[PDB]
Amino acid sequence: SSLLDIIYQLRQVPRWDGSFQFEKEDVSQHSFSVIAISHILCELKETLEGKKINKEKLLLYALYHDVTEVVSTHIISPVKKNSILKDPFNAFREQIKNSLFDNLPITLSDTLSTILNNNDLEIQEIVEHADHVDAYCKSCIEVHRGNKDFISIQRSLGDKLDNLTKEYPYLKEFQNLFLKDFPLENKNYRY
Amino acid sequence: SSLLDIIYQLRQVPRWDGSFQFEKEDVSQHSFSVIAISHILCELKETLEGKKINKEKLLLYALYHDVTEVVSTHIISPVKKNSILKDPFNAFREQIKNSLFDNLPITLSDTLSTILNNNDLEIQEIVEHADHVDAYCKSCIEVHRGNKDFISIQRSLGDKLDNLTKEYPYLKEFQNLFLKDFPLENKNYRY
Numbered sequence: 001s002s003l004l005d006i007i008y009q010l011r012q013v014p015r016w017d018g019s020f021q022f023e024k025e026d027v028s029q030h031s032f033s034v035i036a037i038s039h040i041l042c043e044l045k046e047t048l049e050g051k052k053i054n055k056e057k058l059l060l061y062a063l064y065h066d067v068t069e070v071v072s073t074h075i076i077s078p079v080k081k082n083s084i085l086k087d088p089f090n091a092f093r094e095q096i097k098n099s100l101f102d103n104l105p106i107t108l109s110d111t112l113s114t115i116l117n118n119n120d121l122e123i124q125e126i127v128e129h130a131d132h133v134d135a136y137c138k139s140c141i142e143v144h145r146g147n148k149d150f151i152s153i154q155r156s157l158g159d160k161l162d163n164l165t166k167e168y169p170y171l172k173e174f175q176n177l178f179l180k181d182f183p184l185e186n187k188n189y190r191y
Numbered sequence: 192s193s194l195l196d197i198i199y200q201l202r203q204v205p206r207w208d209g210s211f212q213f214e215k216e217d218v219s220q221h222s223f224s225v226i227a228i229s230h231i232l233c234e235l236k237e238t239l240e241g242k243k244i245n246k247e248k249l250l251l252y253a254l255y256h257d258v259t260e261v262v263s264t265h266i267i268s269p270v271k272k273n274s275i276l277k278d279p280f281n282a283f284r285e286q287i288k289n290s291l292f293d294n295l296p297i298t299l300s301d302t303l304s305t306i307l308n309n310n311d312l313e314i315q316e317i318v319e320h321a322d323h324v325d326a327y328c329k330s331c332i333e334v335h336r337g338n339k340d341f342i343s344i345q346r347s348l349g350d351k352l353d354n355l356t357k358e359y360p361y362l363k364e365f366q367n368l369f370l371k372d373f374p375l376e377n378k379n380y381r382y
């Protein structure tokens with residue numbers, strides 16, 4: 001099985017191609033943040049919307065949400081979302097899903113296929129929101145480091161996030177709790 | 192709340208201090224791998240030992256298992272396990288847990304305290320095993336890159352892992368499935 005190799009190979013998939021970064025970021029670091037953000041968003045949404053989400057399925061979906069980029073590499077969203085490429089890339093991503101986990105035991109094989117081909121729309125939505133939050137957070141950190149090239153990126157991501165908070169109360173609560181002073185200029189918790 | 196800052200600040204905590212590495216590794220990359228390994232180990236253990244583990248709790252514990260290193264930094268195991276430092280470091284780690292999540296809503300606050308102060312011994316054991324597997328895997332990748340300085344590290348970690356597989360059948364199965372050709376010299380799944 002290539003599953004363990006793929007887990008470590010995601011470190012060789014860089015994000016933010018074409019942009020200067022003070023800190024390069026790979027898919028494993030991004031996926032770690034998305035898992036943690038997805039969990040936080042889930043807890044807020046559960047409390048606000050009066051429900052319970054299957055957190056095993058949510059966390060496993062967040063964990064693997066970008067695993068196909070070990071084949072596709074990470075295509076940045078301005079390119080992937082171009083109308084010329086949007087649908088072919090989604091067909092490409094589906095082709096990768098179909099071939100990934102070849103020589104696995106049926107416990108892993110079906111559990112991993114279940115994770116990849118998830119049709120829980122709500123888990124997919126939470127992780128999509130977490131993905132946008134993480135991109136905004138990265139843009140915040142780069143601007144904080146002094147990276148003027150990320151100011152316009154931060155602006156467009158923050159504008160889209162603002163619009164999302166008008167329609168998704170759990171995102172507005174997340175923004176209130178965490179995103180109005182980010183990153184922390186003084187990291188008092190270290191002492 | 193400092194929770195989101197901490198999630199990203201784990202990227203500034205390096206592992207393997209004092210060892211030459213061709214690729215530097217931070218706690219977020221390590222924790223991503225440990226979450227994924229913990230999940231795989233859990234599925235094997237469930238099938239082999241005739242049980243079901245609460246995978247939400249396992250994954251969340253793996254996600255945060257090293258979060259206190261944002262305060263302590265990452266003390267390498269030859270130092271942390273020294274008899275002079277072993278118990279004081281565990282007391283230090285307990286002091287950090289007690290002060291981390293100050294200004295959070297009770298959904299997050301208690302859920303995060305529950306995660307940190309977990310007393311599920313089996314989840315703690317799975318994550319401890321996943322932590323050792325990940326350290327072995329890193330040593331394998333460095334040796335693969337050509338890093339002779341990690342040969343003796345790989346040997347001692349592989350010896351300890353071998354001994355563990357004699358007592359924990361799910362680890363032996365993991366080793367059989369993934370650790371006899373790692374990393375993959377030819378990454379055929381990319382094409």
Ligand SMILES: Nc1ncnc2c1ncn2[C@@H]1O[C@H](CO)[C@H]1CO
Pocket residue numbers: 015016017019074075076077078131135152153156157
């Ligand atoms: N305004 C922008 N310019 C360049 N890359 C962007 C971008 N917004 C998002 N990305 C990147 O597309 C990825 C998914 O958000 C993100 C990291 O590669």
Ligand SMILES: Nc1ncnc2c1ncn2[C@@H]1O[C@H](CO)[C@H]1CO
Pocket residue numbers: 206207208210265266267268269322326343344347348
């Ligand atoms: N033989 C060894 N020499 C130096 N650091 C080691 C080591 N074995 C494990 N470590 C490091 O201790 C950490 C936990 O395994 C690991 C990464 O920092």
Ligand SMILES: [Mg+2]
Pocket residue numbers: 030034065066131
């Ligand atoms: Mg993503």
Ligand SMILES: [Mg+2]
Pocket residue numbers: 221225256257322
């Ligand atoms: Mg660890």
